[PDB]
Design a protein around this ligand. Structure first.
Ligand SMILES: Cc1ccc(-c2ccc3c(C)n[nH]c3c2)c2c1[C@H](N(C)C(=O)c1ncccc1C(F)F)CCC2
Length: 277
């Protein structure tokens, strides 16, 4: 509720709670590790102990009202941190004309690119483990009243230790590609944790196919009509039977009947547990 778009004492104090000192951050301007509609994100060094980080500059501190709600929520609610959620490390106010927003560094980038890379060899166990990590991150987001709205493998990041973090690029909200949306979202534009559970099922399917495009047999214009006839994504070749049953539960047409993220954590933890060695 505090104003993040105009200078006021509440905004200044909230940002100070997450300040990174002027001698604590170094931006490696020649190492662009993120590019998109938002511009560039640079690799950096955070002095706490030397740690890798990712830095996005702003034109001024009042531009913080325009960044992801994962970052904005942490500053406002003071309690937002989970190993499987990509959130704020801090903000460096060293230059008034260039405040620096800093997040953790994820070496392997976006999960979809990682699993599509022909040089990488993640096993089925690794892929299912990435799915379990996403469900734990989402279970935490759901507990915080967050609705992701764009859950897909391209929005999940993978770090050097193989920790997956659910990332947000401006669409999450405290409470789109059509082939990831729940039926009731395609029909009524309503988004809840249950519509994220539907996107999660699609995410699992992306992991089991190593990033294949969903519904190769269905045009974008016909996806809703296809789902209305009870049709769903087919079981990928290396997907265990109980994992596909979990996927089908995620795509139940009645939102109330889909499992919660806590139950997904439990079911996927039991399947992942069978991958020994
Ligand atoms: C601020 C920020 C800092 C570092 C990253 C990042 C990137 C890559 C890596 C990699 C590869 N590892 N770690 C990384 C961190 C990102 C952001 C993102 N972001 C740009 C914003 O929230 C944002 N900012 C300004 C205006 C609008 C928005 C919003 F609408 F998208 C959220 C996720 C990416």
């Amino acid at each position: 509720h505090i104003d993040l778009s105009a200078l006021n004492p509440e905004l200044v104090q909230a940002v100070q709670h997450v300040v990174i000192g002027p001698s604590s951050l170094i931006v490696h301007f020649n190492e662009v590790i993120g590019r998109g509609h938002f511009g560039c994100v640079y690799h950096g060094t955070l002095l706490d102990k030397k740690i890798h980080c990712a830095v996005k500059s702003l034109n001024r501190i009042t531009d913080i009202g325009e960044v992801s709600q994962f970052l904005t929520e942490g500053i406002i609610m003071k309690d937002f941190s989970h190993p499987n959620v990509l959130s704020l490390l801090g903000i460096c106010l060293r230059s008034e004309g260039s405040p620096l927003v800093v997040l953790p560094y994820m070496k392997h980038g976006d999960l979809r690119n990682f699993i599509r890379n022909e040089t990488h060899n993640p096993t089925v166990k690794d892929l299912i483990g990435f799915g379990l990590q996403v469900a734990k991150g989402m279970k935490y987001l759901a507990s915080k009243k967050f609705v992701h709205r764009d859950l897909a493998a391209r929005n999940c990041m993978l770090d050097e230790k193989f920790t997956v973090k659910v990332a947000d690029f401006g669409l999450a909200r405290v409470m789109l590609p059509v082939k990831w949306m729940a039926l009731e979202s395609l029909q009524t534009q309503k988004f809840t944790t249950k519509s994220d559970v539907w996107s999660f099922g699609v995410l699992l399917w992306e992991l089991m196919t190593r990033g294949a495009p969903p519904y190769p047999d269905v045009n974008t214009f016909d996806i809703t009509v296809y789902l209305l006839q009870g049709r769903r994504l087919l079981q990928p070749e290396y997907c265990p039977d109980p994992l596909y049953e979990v996927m089908l539960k995620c795509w139940h047409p009645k939102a109330e009947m889909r499992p919660s993220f806590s139950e997904l954590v439990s079911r996927i933890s039991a399947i992942f547990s069978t991958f020994i060695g």
